[PDB]
Design a protein around this ligand. Structure first.
Ligand SMILES: CSc1ccccc1N1C[C@@H](C(N)=O)CCC1=O
Ligand SMILES: [Zn+2]
Length: 139
């Protein structure tokens, strides 16, 4: 689990969105595994606006943060699960690291701010949904 809070927005993994997230829907993209809902309270997370390929992510299944190198956002094939059939997921970044289903929502951060959230895993890899292109999150 985990979310990003910036301004009057809440960014969550689309497969983990609640009834309240859907009742206050701003934007959702199944191909990205992202959903953004509106909030009454003001969030103060800083979104990164950069092309970094190094950062640190939080891994709940180890209660630890790990430094990782990660690929640029791209269209990557993701094995079927109970939330989605086998498909290509867009705007995804991969790194060598540990990730279990419950790790979804862990934040990846660089020196500039939040880069994305854990969205895929298995085989010794960890995949992050990028949010750096969603410039509207800051306005
Ligand atoms: C670390 S997430 C993971 C790990 C192992 C096996 C499956 C997953 N996924 C991948 C997710 C997706 N974005 O398609 C769907 C939900 C899920 O549990
Ligand atoms: Zn950066």
């Amino acid at each position: 689990s985990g979310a990003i809070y910036v301004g009057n927005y809440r960014v969550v993994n689309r497969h983990l969105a609640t009834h309240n997230d859907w009742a206050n829907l701003v934007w959702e993209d199944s191909s990205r595994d992202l959903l953004v809902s509106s909030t009454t309270a003001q969030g103060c997370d800083t979104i990164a606006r950069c092309d970094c390929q190094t950062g640190v992510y939080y891994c709940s299944s180890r209660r630890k943060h790990y430094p990782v190198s990660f690929s640029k956002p791209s269209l990557i094939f993701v094995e079927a699960s109970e939330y989605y059939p086998a498909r290509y997921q867009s705007h995804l970044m991969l790194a060598v690291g540990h990730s279990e289903p419950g790790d979804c929502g862990g934040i990846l951060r660089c020196q500039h701010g939040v880069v994305g959230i854990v969205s895929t895993g298995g085989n010794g890899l960890v995949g992050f949904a990028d949010v750096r292109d969603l410039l509207w999150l800051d306005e």
